Design a protein around this nucleic acid. Structure first.
Ligand SMILES: Nc1nc2c(ncn2[C@H]2C[C@H](O)[C@@H](COP(=O)(O)NP(=O)(O)OP(=O)(O)O)O2)c(=O)[nH]1
Ligand SMILES: [Mg+2]
Ligand SMILES: [Mg+2]
Length: 430
DNA sequence: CTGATGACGT
DNA sequence: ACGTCATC
């Protein structure tokens, strides 16, 4: 009771851009605004692979990982923007630069951890303490929270979603003001106020909309964010967790969407995150290991300690291209030409990285997939990255993987390559 | 027919 | 160092 930690020590947000690559293209081309729209890579094969979908288009059933030709069957009026292609491959530069615009705005409010091209965690604990003292015991107006949902409310003794959002918010606030909630609840609420301000700054200064989750840790904040997309933010309190997790499929929690989550379901014979509370920490550790068992024991109670890392920039700079089926690379000259294309993009991005960020990569990682191998990576090899030179980098990459070629002929490559990947890593101050 | 990231185990 | 998982 009195000594049991509840994981309510921090206020953490996760801000994620709505259909990000789509918004980037809609900003640039107003003809695409407020329309069923998707972003695709390439065009010749099946119209290209969709990687981002506007909410108007999702209503037609259009999704990520769908071929545009198939999407067009669901949504005949679907508008498409294609990712820039340079040196024969997809080039994501425009989106990476748009990301930087957003991350820089977020960094004005608090320490952020860049978690992907379009989202970042924010530790608002300090900022919340600051705002609380400034407030002097003022109540918090619903007006300060115009886009916030409180997960789990309204409850207890209007048929439109905004009415529901407001009713839940009023119940939450009415309980704060009357002292029926906790200090952590107040801290989350102020966190949500700050997140409203951050999301407003982002939209004013970039044109992009985002959603956000506000809770006590990264996992709950990430889960909260997805609850009311697009263009809304969600507060998940410690108190909301039991009901939230009681029907929450295990795969929905970050990190349990793959093999581990499937083993939890199969071994334990359960379906929902809440059902995990019925196992001792030792039981969970027995099945899933010491680290995972401890994590699961705490997580199913809404508790998680992973810190928001102070990291605004990516740790790695990489590029890759797949060569599936017939297109797989079967000659040495082919392998070298494509390694050069990758190396040149890499050099451009690295040179720019060095000027912007005062650091240099010191390691080059080379990864390939061989034809007939199910694995994402067949082989990974590294060498020193001592110079930002595309020809040297491509030559070095070839040197590290050339032993893989089992073909007898000098000029031929077997088994054929279905993937090439170059990644610059191990950055040092410059 | 995708192109990335970051984390962890050994 | 190298392989694998997770996310999308
Ligand atoms: N190259 C590549 N880019 C991708 C892929 N998947 C996603 N992206 C890119 C395109 C995405 O726009 C972006 C951000 O990823 P999310 O946040 O996961 N999806 P979004 O922001 O689109 O919608 P939502 O409102 O649902 O958050 O990353 C992929 O498989 N390949
Ligand atoms: Mg997003
Ligand atoms: Mg995202």
């Amino acid at each position: 009771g009195p000594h049991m930690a509840t994981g309510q020590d921090r206020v953490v947000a996760l801000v994620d851009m709505d259909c990000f690559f789509v918004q980037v293209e809609q900003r640039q081309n107003p003809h695409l605004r407020n329309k069923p729209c998707a972003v695709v890579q390439y065009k010749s094969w099946k119209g290209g692979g969709i990687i981002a979908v506007s909410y108007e288009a999702r209503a037609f059933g259009v999704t990520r990982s769908m071929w545009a030709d198939d999407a067009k069957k669901l949504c005949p009026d679907l508008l498409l923007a294609q990712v820039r292609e340079s040196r024969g491959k997809a080039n994501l530069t425009k989106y990476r630069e748009a990301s930087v615009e957003v991350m820089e705005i977020m960094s004005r409010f608090a320490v952020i951890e860049r978690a992907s091209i379009d989202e970042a965690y924010v530790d608002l604990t300090s900022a919340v303490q600051e705002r609380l003292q400034k407030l002097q015991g003022q109540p918090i107006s619903a007006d300060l929270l115009p886009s916030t949902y409180i997960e789990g409310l309204p409850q207890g003794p209007t048929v439109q979603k905004e009415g529901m959002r407001k009713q839940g918010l009023f119940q939450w606030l009415d309980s704060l003001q009357i002292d029926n909630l906790t200090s952590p609840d107040l801290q989350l609420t102020v966190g949500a106020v700050i997140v409203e301000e951050m999301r407003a700054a982002i939209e004013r200064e970039t044109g992009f909309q985002c959603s956000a989750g506000i809770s006590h840790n990264k996992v709950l904040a990430k889960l909260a964010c997805g609850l009311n997309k697009p263009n809304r933010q969600t507060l998940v309190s410690h108190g909301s967790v039991p009901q939230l997790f009681s029907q929450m499929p295990i795969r929905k929690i970050r990190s349990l969407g793959g093999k581990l989550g499937a083993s939890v379901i199969e071994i334990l014979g359960i379906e929902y995150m809440g059902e995990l509370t019925q196992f001792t920490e030792s039981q969970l550790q027995s099945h899933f290991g010491e680290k995972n068992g401890s994590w699961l024991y705490a997580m199913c109670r809404g508790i998680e300690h992973d810190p928001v890392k102070p990291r605004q920039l990516p740790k790695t700079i990489g590029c890759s291209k797949n060569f599936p089926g017939k297109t797989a690379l079967a000659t040495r000259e082919q392998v070298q030409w494509w390694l050069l294309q990758l190396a040149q993009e890499l050099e451009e991005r690295l040179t720019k990285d060095r000027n912007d960020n005062d650091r240099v990569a010191t390691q080059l990682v080379v990864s390939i997939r061989v034809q007939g191998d199910k694995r994402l990576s067949s082989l990974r090899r590294c060498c020193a990255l001592t110079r930002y030179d595309a020809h040297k980098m491509s030559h070095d990459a070839f040197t590290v993987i050339k032993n893989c070629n089992t073909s007898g002929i000098q000029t031929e490559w077997s088994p054929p390559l279905t993937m090439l990947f170059l990644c610059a890593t191990k950055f040092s101050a410059s």
